[PDB]
Amino acid sequence: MFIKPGRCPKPAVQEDFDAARYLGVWYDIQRLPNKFQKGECATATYSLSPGVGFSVFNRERLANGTIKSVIGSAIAEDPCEPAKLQFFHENAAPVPYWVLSTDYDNYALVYSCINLGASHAAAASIVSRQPTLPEETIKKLQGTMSSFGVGVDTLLTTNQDAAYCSAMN
Amino acid sequence: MFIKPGRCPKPAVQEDFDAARYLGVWYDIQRLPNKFQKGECATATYSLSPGVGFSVFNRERLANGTIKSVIGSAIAEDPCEPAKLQFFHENAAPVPYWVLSTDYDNYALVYSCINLGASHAAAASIVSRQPTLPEETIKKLQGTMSSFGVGVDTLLTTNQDAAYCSAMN
Amino acid sequence: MFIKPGRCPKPAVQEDFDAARYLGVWYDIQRLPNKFQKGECATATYSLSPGVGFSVFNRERLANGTIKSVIGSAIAEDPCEPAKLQFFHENAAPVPYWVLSTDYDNYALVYSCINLGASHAAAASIVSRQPTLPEETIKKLQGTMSSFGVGVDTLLTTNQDAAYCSAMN
Amino acid sequence: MFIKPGRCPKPAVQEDFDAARYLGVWYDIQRLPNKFQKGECATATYSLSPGVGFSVFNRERLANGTIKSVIGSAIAEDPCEPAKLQFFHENAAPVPYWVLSTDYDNYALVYSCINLGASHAAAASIVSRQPTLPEETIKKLQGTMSSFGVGVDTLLTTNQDAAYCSAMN
Ligand SMILES: C=CC1=C(C)/C(=C/c2[nH]c(/C=C3N=C(/C=C4\NC(=O)C(C)=C4C=C)C(C)=C\3CCC(=O)O)c(CCC(=O)O)c2C)NC1=O
Ligand SMILES: C=CC1=C(C)/C(=C/c2[nH]c(/C=C3N=C(/C=C4\NC(=O)C(C)=C4C=C)C(C)=C\3CCC(=O)O)c(CCC(=O)O)c2C)NC1=O
Ligand SMILES: C=CC1=C(C)/C(=C/c2[nH]c(/C=C3N=C(/C=C4\NC(=O)C(C)=C4C=C)C(C)=C\3CCC(=O)O)c(CCC(=O)O)c2C)NC1=O
Ligand SMILES: C=CC1=C(C)/C(=C/c2[nH]c(/C=C3N=C(/C=C4\NC(=O)C(C)=C4C=C)C(C)=C\3CCC(=O)O)c(CCC(=O)O)c2C)NC1=O
């Protein structure tokens, strides 16, 4: 199920979020079941933007070996709340993007929730600067999610095997 | 599935919508699969409000014979667009309510869609001032929906049988 | 003036706000300069609503003795933040209404800010269950506003002299 | 003044708007009174963005010869309405930006309105690819604004005299 009961949670975000250090490539390690990622080998590339915010380039290897991509823009509409962002993708409506925790150098936890009456629809990914994350960090970012309701048993481990994700090199 | 592909449509609404005549009791005849209606015998009661807009009282007979109810408030945030309303229910986030077509005296078609990136989540009900609607009107309000994408084959015919909905009298 | 430099602040609101004990009649003691109050002797009557939230009745005397009034509906769009309400006045667009402090029985502090780029337009009023309030309360509620950037030297003391306000039976 | 009575209009926008042909340098010819332009010789440079939308560079001369500038990002939040854009300027909150008419090669009409209860605050500018525009074009774009309530007698002609604007290499 993608519509989970209950309204959107209001989890804590990363304090003094430095977007400049958050830039670069991030590998999807574990993700909540979503409908936008239709393949595996997912990567998020955050690069510089001429105006405000940063740019977004997302890539995945579909099962047919085809690499699908989406471009987008990221802005924190409240500059005093830099970790709560709004992501504007192509052919898409504005979606929320909240950095809950990151070291900028190894791990990152991201959350998106849109309210639907008394139900909600959420997106979550555990990302790494490498195609793998230590199990300790995964178990700790999984506890941050369990703390505000997420069934960390619904999490899907994204395939990042070097031989399968070879077209993404 | 409750998350359908594609963004929210922008269908046409009832012209010169008179909310005063739309007040009263409406019976659910056919509805898109939703998560808020967990029973049958659904009824919508729109009554007067002391300030702006009108009040909302929704009732259904659950399978245990229990009548569940929800109260709410309805406001058209744009007075020059009176058919595009916002419904504020209890323990719920603000949801959209658009009257697409009504005679005020027999039939009414309602639509709610919230965007979720490149996907959407929608609610739809064909309502009648009586527990039944003629099949001609159902087939015509079903064509208005087919015209903007709705799979009118996903529609659920709400049970309004007099003997089963007897606790709602 | 009315459009002041700087984005809107996000002040703290009253905790465990009870809109039921907030119901009744509030008299304007002091107000930030605004464009909707074109008179004095102002009163805000918060009443009950059949649906969600409370009803609004705002009354004031103009310099020509005429009593002008407005009706509106008040709704907390997030039930988990019931002190951050939205006010839907007649012939008017949705405007914010935040109860920052209230003892329900004597005083209340209210703030409204809409963002206008790098500037803002704000409304704030100190209210009482009586046509007067003690200087100690006025001075502490002024210190709360001062903490978030409000020039308390721009505030205007509303006229609540029973002789001037005699048309308010 | 700046806060004018009445809610915001919903004017018509340019059809099949091409943001690519809209890119480049636009000079301010005439403008509605606003609080962000504190000088003259104004220019808006619309450039390319690595993600969604275009970049913004707004430049003006102050009475003291200093050239003040702002950077921002422009995004059409609804891809099916690309002429209704949102502008995210630096140190500023999201503000609306609507291209109502443009031939891309000579003229453009732009409007912004945020609602302030039963009042409103609006921004509008007539732009040219040259520091001047023909009276026939100015007069037709004034008639478009006049159709939706804009007092064209409040408009201000921006100074684009090459001698005064000499600091703009
Ligand atoms: C409910 C919230 C919600 C979010 C957050 C969201 C994001 C989002 N991700 C997308 C694609 C994508 N998103 C990713 C990857 C990621 N995306 C991430 O949020 C992160 C951190 C990764 C992980 C690396 C990839 C690889 C694509 C491209 C998929 C494709 O083109 O097939 C798109 C493009 C539209 C689409 O193809 O469906 C959107 C809007 N959509 C939503 O509905
Ligand atoms: C995606 C949009 C969307 C809408 C529109 C929506 C409406 C909505 N309908 C509700 C209940 C209800 N709604 C109805 C009935 C109706 N409801 C109607 O929209 C109409 C026209 C009928 C038909 C008569 C009933 C009977 C209940 C009470 C269900 C219960 O309490 O068990 C509630 C209360 C919260 C809940 O119990 O889930 C909401 C928010 N929720 C959404 O997520
Ligand atoms: C930027 C935010 C903002 C707010 C909050 C706002 C409220 C607001 N107050 C109004 C009327 C009014 N408002 C009040 C009274 C009050 N108002 C209060 O919120 C309180 C506490 C009092 C004081 C007791 C009165 C008396 C009127 C009617 C004035 C008249 O009709 O002459 C109206 C009706 C529109 C109008 O008459 O112009 C609005 C929208 N307007 C805005 O632009
Ligand atoms: C209510 C709506 C609204 C809008 C649209 C708006 C735009 C806007 N224009 C700005 C700067 C600016 N705006 C412009 C120029 C232009 N601006 C234009 O949209 C166009 C067409 C020109 C003219 C060519 C310039 C030159 C500056 C910088 C002024 C300076 O720094 O002194 C800023 C930065 C904040 C500031 O410097 O105060 C904003 C938010 N602000 C608002 O409040």
Residue numbers in the entry:
A (entry chain A), B (entry chain A), C (entry chain B), D (entry chain B): 20 to 188
Share the article's original sentences.
Sandercyanin (SFP) is a BV-binding lipocalin protein found in the skin mucus of the Canadian walleye, Stizostedion vitreum (formerly Sander vitreus). BV associates non-covalently to each SFP monomer in a ZZZssa conformation and is stabilized by aromatic stacking, hydrophobic interactions, and water-mediated H-bonding inside the lipocalin-like beta-barrel fold of SFP. The binding of BV induces tetramerization of SFP via interaction between amino acid residues from adjacent monomeric subunits.
On excitation with 380 nm and 630 nm, Y142A showed a red-shifted fluorescence with maxima at 685 nm and a fluorescence quantum yield (0.004) equivalent to the monomeric SFP variants. We hypothesized that the mutation of the large Tyr into Ala created enough space for the D-ring to rotate in the tetrameric protein giving rise to dual peaks in the red region of the absorbance spectrum. To test this, we determined the crystal structure of the Y142A–BV complex at 2.65 Å (ESI Table S1†). However, to our surprise, the BV adopted the ZZZssa conformation in the crystal structure, with a water molecule accommodated in the position of the mutated side chain of Y142 (similar to the V71E structure). The similarity of BV conformation to the wild-type protein could not explain the observed differences in the absorption spectra. In contrast to the wild-type protein, BV bound to Y142A shows loss of fine structures of several RR bands in 532 nm excited spectra, specifically four bands at 1695, 1647, 1625, and 1596 cm−1 associated with D-ring in-plane stretching vibrations. Significant broadening of these RR bands strongly suggests the occurrence of multiple BV conformers bound to Y142A in the solution state. The increased stability provided to the ZZZssa conformation of BV by the residues of the neighboring subunit may be sufficient to shift the equilibrium towards this conformation in the high concentration of the protein in the crystals of Y142A. Hence, we conclude that both conformations of BV are possible in the Y142A variant in solution, even though only one is observed in the crystal structure.
